[PDB]
Structure 1
Amino acid sequence: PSLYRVLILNDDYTPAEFVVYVLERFFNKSREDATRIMLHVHQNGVGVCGVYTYEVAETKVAQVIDSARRHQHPLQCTMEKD
């Protein structure tokens, strides 16, 4: 079964603390891991949030976009085969 990684992209608008919040809320990240991934996205432009089956990855991507827009942030989230 081929799994899929969920990615978040950097942007200049979305607050760092919201990205940490998203990682903790939707990707079961510890505070430390969420902070490191957020910083990785900031530094490298993209970061890996988790790995799931195709349909679950689709769900996570959707949940992040929904949350982000309702929080008034343009945060971009997508997926790739892992």
Structure 2
Amino acid sequence: EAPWVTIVWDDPVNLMSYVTYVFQKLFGYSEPHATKLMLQVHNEGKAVVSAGSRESMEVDVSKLHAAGLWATMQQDR
């Protein structure tokens, strides 16, 4: 019943510019939004990047994995 979130985890390989681009490409986010989330990943170690049903977050995780980003999902409490 609960809503879920997709989290992207910091990784030591992917370019900062790539991560900003992926968030725009996969989610349609604006450049300031994508950059903000990228920097949160890089400076906090992780960031919630999207939110919704468990099934919707399963798709976001799969899309992010195909892009090569470290994504997981968990219930939002």
Q: Work out whether the TM-score is over 0.5.
A: yes
The answer on 1:42 being equivalent to 2:42 is yes
Write the letter of the residue equivalent to 1:20. Answer: T
For 1:76, the equivalent position in structure 2 comes to 70
The answer to which of 51-60 and 23-32 deviates more is 23-32
Q: After the TM superposition, list the runs of 4 or more consecutive aligned residues in structure 1 that deviate by more than 3 angstroms.
A: none
Structure 2 stretches lacking a partner, 5+ long = none
CA RMSD of aligned residues (A): 1.1
For 1:23, the equivalent position in structure 2 comes to 23
Deviations 1:6-65 (A, max 9, x none): 010001111011111111122231100100110111001000101011111001100110
Aligned residues: 76
Structure 1 stretches lacking a partner, 5+ long = 69-74
Distance 2:39 2:26 in 1: 17
Q: Percent identity?
A: 28
Calculate the TM-score normalised by the size of structure 1.
0.85
